[PDB]
């Protein structure tokens, strides 16, 4: 049942993608507002997909996926490895490594303890920020009757 929802979300995302490519293929390009609108649709879809993934991520971490006896392993193994490929985008992971190195500070060693102190600083900073938000938000406020006249001119009655 969860896998059906996941497949639905993925299908929608794929559709939005294909549509985007289609809009791009035209020379003049589409009205900017429309492109942004479709972009927002994709946003909603992908939000749903990530929330659903994460909600089932405990139940998704739970299984094992391999080819069944009916799979044409002989002819194409490579497409099967592609479908099963768990390696990230080497760029997404290169900017994950680049972000992580750039992410302040924060080098392994550490060690945890002191890292938990860092995380603590982050969390208390978050609480302070929330309070500030609360107060800042607290600072603002959210003649006559036409017929009768005519009748007089025509007959003289008041």
């Amino acid at each position: 049942q969860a896998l059906d929802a996941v497949r639905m979300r993925l299908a929608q995302l794929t559709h939005s993608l294909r549509r985007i490519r289609d809009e791009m293929s035209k020379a003049e390009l589409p009205q900017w507002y429309t492109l942004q609108s479709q972009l927002n649709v994709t946003l909603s879809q992908l939000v749903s997909v990530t929330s659903t993934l994460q909600h089932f991520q405990e139940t998704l971490d739970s299984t094992v996926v391999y080819p069944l006896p009916k799979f044409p392993t002989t002819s194409h193994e490579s497409l099967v490895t592609t479908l099963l490929r768990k390696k990230n985008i080497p760029e997404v992971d290169e900017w994950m490594k680049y972000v992580r190195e750039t992410s302040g500070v924060t080098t392994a060693l550490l060690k945890d303890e002191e890292i938990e102190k860092l995380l603590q600083q982050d969390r208390e900073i978050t609480n302070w920020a929330r309070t500030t938000f609360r107060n800042e938000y607290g600072k603002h406020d959210f003649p006559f009757n036409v017929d009768d006249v005519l009748k007089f001119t025509f007959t003289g009655e008041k």
Binding site: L35, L53, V65, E77, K86, N88
Partner: protein, 139 residues
């Protein structure tokens, strides 16, 4: 989950077949010496009957969840108590296949899609020129 182990030469000193496929499972880095098979091997030094022998012993188990010769088999890593699994490895084309999740593959998907989404978004976002009377125009 990200890697593929192959000892293409290991087929050459033996030939690659079923009991062979088990042993070749033992040869690859995917194998653990903390399993029962290593114990049985060491004891022997000092295919159905094997499965018969695993019924006596208690511990982690690796069994044969397929035969398509001479290419494919599933080899199942299961925790026997009723038999609970653990993970499922496939053997296809003299290469050990990593058993990659479920969740992780989906993670990969999401990651990739999101990344290029971001790229397109920024690249296009640079382009437009805005005037209050003109709104957003593309020069």
């Amino acid at each position: 989950d990200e890697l593929q182990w192959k000892s293409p030469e290991w087929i050459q000193v033996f030939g690659l077949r079923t009991e062979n496929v088990l042993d070749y499972f033992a040869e690859s880095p995917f194998f653990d010496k903390t399993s029962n098979n290593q114990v049985i091997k060491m004891q022997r030094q000092f295919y159905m009957q094997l499965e018969e022998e695993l019924m006596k012993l208690d511990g982690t188990e690796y069994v044969l969840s397929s035969v398509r010769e001479p290419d494919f088999w599933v080899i199942r890593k299961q925790r026997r108590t009723e038999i609970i699994p653990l993970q499922d490895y496939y053997i296809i084309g003299a290469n050990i296949y990593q058993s990659p999740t479920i969740f992780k593959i989906v993670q990969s998907r999401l990651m990739s899609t999101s990344y290029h989404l971001n790229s397109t978004l920024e690249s296009l976002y640079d382009l437009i020129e805005f005037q209050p009377s003109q709104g957003v125009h593309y020069k």
